[PDB]
């Protein structure tokens, strides 16, 4: 079913391309390199069954970096509250958020 010829011969036929944290050209990093490094090191050698429970924190952080679902939710909440308080005139946006900032290098 899975004859691990690569591991028996030490070949690396396709393992160079399986993960995002593995030796990219010119050392260009993946967007989620640290999260994946952490999740891989947390779950290494403990087996699949233990890794899903005991490394769920690292994997949840990794998935958040990948898809950013909670970040978009928080931004949407903030902007809805801003829209609501602006419509009634309660809140006034600062100049550096309207296009009149003092830009810095």
């Amino acid at each position: 079913p899975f004859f691990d010829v690569q591991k028996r011969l030490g070949l690396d036929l396709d393992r160079w391309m399986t993960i995002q944290s593995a030796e990219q050209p010119h050392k260009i990093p993946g967007r989620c390199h640290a999260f994946e490094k952490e999740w891989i090191e947390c779950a290494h050698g403990i087996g699949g069954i233990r890794a899903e429970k005991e490394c769920k924190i690292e994997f949840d952080d990794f998935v958040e970096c990948l898809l950013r679902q909670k970040t978009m939710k928080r931004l949407s909440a903030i902007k809805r509250q801003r829209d609501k308080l602006i419509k009634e005139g309660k809140y006034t946006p600062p100049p550096h958020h309207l296009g009149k900032e003092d830009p810095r290098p």
Binding site: W16, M17, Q20, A22, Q24, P25, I28, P29, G30, R31, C32, L66, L67
Partner: protein, 98 residues
């Protein structure tokens, strides 16, 4: 997820449906198969670019290579069906039953 991702997955579903529901011509189904490949290429490319997996930039090209092989394979079979019947209709191929 993003609106763009939803649209590409919808394109795959529509092409898959098109392949599944045959009409008269075989060429139309072959086109649907190509459409599925096109949507897979776009989806994988968007995911790869977004996450900056650098080495995975080559897999959509491999995808295209195999898609071309499949397309070539499909056209050969169509040539043989048309030579047999003078038409590329699905209804003609009913010789074998279950």
């Amino acid at each position: 997820m993003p609106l763009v991702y939803m649209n590409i997955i919808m394109a795959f579903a529509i092409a898959l449906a098109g392949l599944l529901m045959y009409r008269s011509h075989l060429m139309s189904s072959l086109l649907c198969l190509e459409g599925m490949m096109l949507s897979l290429f776009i989806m994988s490319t968007l995911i790869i670019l977004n996450t900056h997996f650098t080495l995975a930039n080559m897999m959509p090209i491999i995808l295209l290579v195999f898609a071309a092989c499949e397309a070539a394979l499909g056209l050969s079979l169509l040539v043989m069906v048309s030579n047999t019947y003078g038409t590329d209709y699905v209804q003609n191929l009913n010789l074998l039953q279950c």
